[PDB]
């Protein structure tokens, strides 16, 4: 009961330090991405310490399992190098007992990760989306440049104005090409709403509010002779910020209570994804105890980068399987539990390698 709270203190302290460093690095990378986007002109520099503040729970929920993995590796490597566990084993301590000692901090980490996954990351993502969409820090239409075109997604929508003025009114021409990605063969969905005057307005009720002062709308695809001419005024079209919708979807912000009774495959796949991040905690706890056996020649730091690569592969495989799930291909009965079982089996292979070798040698003689 003394070794228990000795190992559980070492592991927790090392995990805290590693998690802090990893969080700093990940936040820095996301900040370089958002700063480059703001440099391009599609963001408000003032609204940058809330975008990063509302994304911390997701980074923490993705980092804490890796923090525990590396903390277990470092702490138990230190104990192995200092001849401190050879005297625990030479007095009676098993390796299943070591696993049982290690599974106590893993429970606290799993509880923290489960809370972050099921009740705090959805709220943070919801608030982040609320800000970036509703509060319209500055829309892309407030960054127009005369003579230069502007596009979105796969060039599906290209907005351009010939004249740019401080009053933002009576613009020479609004060349907008709102194209449907799929609208069947006969109609390509590509339409041009060009007006003699640019009617930029308050843009408050429906986010970016845009209407044509005079109106000249054509739905005729250039390939065929079918021309759809609407020379009347074009009705108000509501433009959302592509950045907010591109990275954050509705599935990442719905409350967890709405996923239990849902039938939409996306919601069920998201629920299965949420109840997995606590599970990597136990999986990597089982994967880490056998791997932390080191020699003074190897040291603690030799197998940290391979562990990071293994964890990243785990996460990538989980994300890919979730995509194949909510796309309707993989049946929802099996889910991501087969990936979880694959990595659990890898961990069990690592754990029982030495007992298997000893039992094989015993029967050989």
């Amino acid at each position: 009961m003394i070794v228990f709270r000795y190992l559980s203190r070492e592991v927790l302290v090392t995990m805290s330090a590693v998690s802090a460093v990893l969080l700093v690095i990940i936040m820095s990378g996301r900040f370089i991405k958002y700063l480059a986007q703001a440099a391009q002109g599609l963001l408000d520099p003032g609204s940058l310490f809330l975008i990063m503040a509302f994304r911390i729970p997701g980074f923490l929920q993705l980092i804490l399992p890796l923090g525990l993995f590396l903390g277990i590796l470092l702490a138990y490597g230190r104990l192995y190098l200092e001849s401190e566990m050879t005297v625990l084993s030479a007095t009676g301590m098993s390796q299943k007992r070591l696993l049982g000692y290690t599974m106590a901090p893993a429970l606290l980490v799993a509880i923290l990760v489960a809370w972050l996954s099921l009740f705090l990351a959805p709220q943070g993502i919801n608030q982040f989306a609320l800000l970036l969409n509703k509060q319209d820090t500055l829309t892309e239409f407030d960054t127009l440049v005369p003579g230069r075109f502007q596009a979105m997604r796969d060039g599906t929508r290209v907005t351009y104005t010939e004249e740019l003025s401080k009053d933002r009114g009576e613009l020479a021409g609004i060349f907008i090409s709102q194209k449907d990605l799929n609208s069947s063969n006969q109609e390509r969905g590509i339409s041009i709403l060009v007006a003699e005057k640019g009617t930029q307005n308050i843009q408050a009720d429906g986010s970016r509010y845009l209407i044509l002062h005079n109106g000249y709308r054509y739905d005729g695809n250039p390939g065929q002779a079918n021309y759809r001419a609407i020379q009347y005024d074009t009705y108000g079209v509501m433009l959302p910020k592509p950045e907010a919708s591109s990275e954050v979807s509705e599935r990442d912000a719905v409350p967890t209570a709405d996923l239990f009774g849902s039938d939409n495959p996306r919601y069920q796949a998201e629920l299965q994804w949420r109840l997995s991040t606590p599970l990597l905690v136990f999986v990597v706890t089982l994967l880490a105890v056998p791997l932390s056996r080191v020699n003074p020649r190897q040291g603690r730091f030799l197998k940290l980068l391979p562990a990071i690569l293994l964890y990243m592969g785990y996460l990538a495989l989980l994300i890919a399987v979730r995509g194949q799930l909510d796309k309707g291909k993989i049946p929802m009965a099996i889910g991501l539990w087969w990936v979880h079982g694959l990595f659990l089996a890898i961990g069990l292979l690592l754990f029982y390698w030495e007992p298997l070798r000893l039992k094989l040698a015993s029967s050989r003689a």
Binding site: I25, A39, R153, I192, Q298
Partner: protein, 354 residues
């Protein structure tokens, strides 16, 4: 001092080559995994593999300084942990001579880096990007994300793909009249540059007289185009500013300066590509200071971990200070000089402390 120089140089060179190989392999694997997301019918597995393998020299040239730093750390720590540098110092060989011995291969390495980044990386990068665009872009008038848009007097052109040898794909022209009516909307499969002539082969224009009549689709077999789009300029705009050669970057910076646009994004690329030797020299100097100081007895894994962490921090700072120069008001030169400057300062400090 010939045998010692060759010994140290060979060790450092081999370590740097191995580290560069491993880093490039990891980068290529990550790039392929990311590119798998945009798989499609027109863009197959073979096309993605070809693009990934064709953008190898660009990644190698970009990641050369990190390979130099980590390889110098590993190779010099191999000698330091074996007490083979204490013997050199106790035989009368100073620290400056060891630094120069390590630095001699670095000159040839950075010369090769400059040569590749000016002659080989732009060529293969242009070949690769053009290919991905041709594959992912032959569908229709507005299909690809890698397209280009331009404005004439009243015409509006959208080129789906821009290929090196003055040939475009999916050229679409909208010719509005004075009353903003669609006088003619056309789509052409290909084009060819012949001085002032652009030949829009396979052009199917759909002109419309707005005097209450139907649009007449006309199948012209070949059309002349009075385009003011020079292919040499076209290849530059569709390419990232960091994927251009040093000479091409210089020419485009001056061309942008003449008209009056903002070339501060291209000055950063010019400084990054030109001042690379100084950055690698500062990184290897700090690695040498690390070996002679804190890490003269630690194991190989700790040296690799420290090198990776320092490289990550250096790249994060470099990428943070790039857009910061454009959003704020300070020259882009300080976005390249500062990190290498403090790295050299720390290396000199730790070397002076012996």
């Amino acid at each position: 001092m010939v045998k010692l120089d060759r010994y140290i140089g060979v060790t450092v060179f081999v370590a740097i080559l191995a580290v560069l190989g491993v880093i490039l392999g990891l980068a290529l694997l990550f790039a392929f995994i990311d590119e798998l997301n945009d798989i499609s019918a027109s863009y197959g597995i073979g096309d993605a593999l070809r693009f990934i393998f064709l953008t190898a020299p660009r990644r190698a040239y970009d990641m050369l300084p990190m390979a130099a730093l980590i390889g110098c750390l590993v190779g010099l720590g191999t000698l330091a942990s074996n007490s083979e540098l204490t013997i050199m110092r106790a035989a009368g060989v100073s620290l400056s001579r060891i630094v120069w011995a390590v630095m001699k291969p670095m000159l040839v390495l950075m010369l090769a880096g400059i040569l590749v980044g000016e002659y080989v990386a732009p060529w293969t990068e242009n070949i690769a990007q053009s290919g991905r665009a041709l594959a992912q872009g032959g569908g229709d008038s507005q299909s690809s994300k890698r397209g280009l848009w331009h404005r004439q007097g009243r015409e509006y052109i959208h080129i789906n793909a821009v290929q090196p040898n003055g040939v475009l794909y999916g050229v679409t022209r909208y010719r509005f009249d004075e009353q903003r009516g669609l006088e003619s909307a056309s789509f052409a499969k290909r084009a060819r540059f012949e001085t002032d002539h652009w030949q829009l082969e396979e052009v199917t224009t759909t002109l419309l007289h707005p005097r209450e009549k139907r649009s007449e689709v006309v199948k012209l077999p070949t059309e002349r185009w009075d385009a003011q789009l020079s292919p040499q300029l076209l290849n530059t705009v569709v390419m990232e500013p960091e994927a251009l050669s040093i000479s091409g970057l210089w020419q485009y910076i001056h061309y942008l300066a003449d008209q009056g646009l903002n070339n501060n994004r291209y000055w950063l690329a010019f400084w990054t590509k030109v001042l690379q030797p100084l950055v690698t020299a500062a990184l290897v100097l700090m690695a040498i200071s690390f070996i002679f100081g804190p890490l003269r007895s630690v194991t190989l894994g700790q040296r690799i971990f420290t090198g990776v962490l320092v490289g990550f921090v250096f790249r994060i700072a470099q990428d943070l200070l790039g857009p910061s120069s454009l959003v704020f008001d300070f020259p882009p030169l300080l976005a390249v000089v500062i990190p290498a400057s403090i790295c050299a300062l720390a290396g000199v400090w730790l070397l002076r402390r012996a």
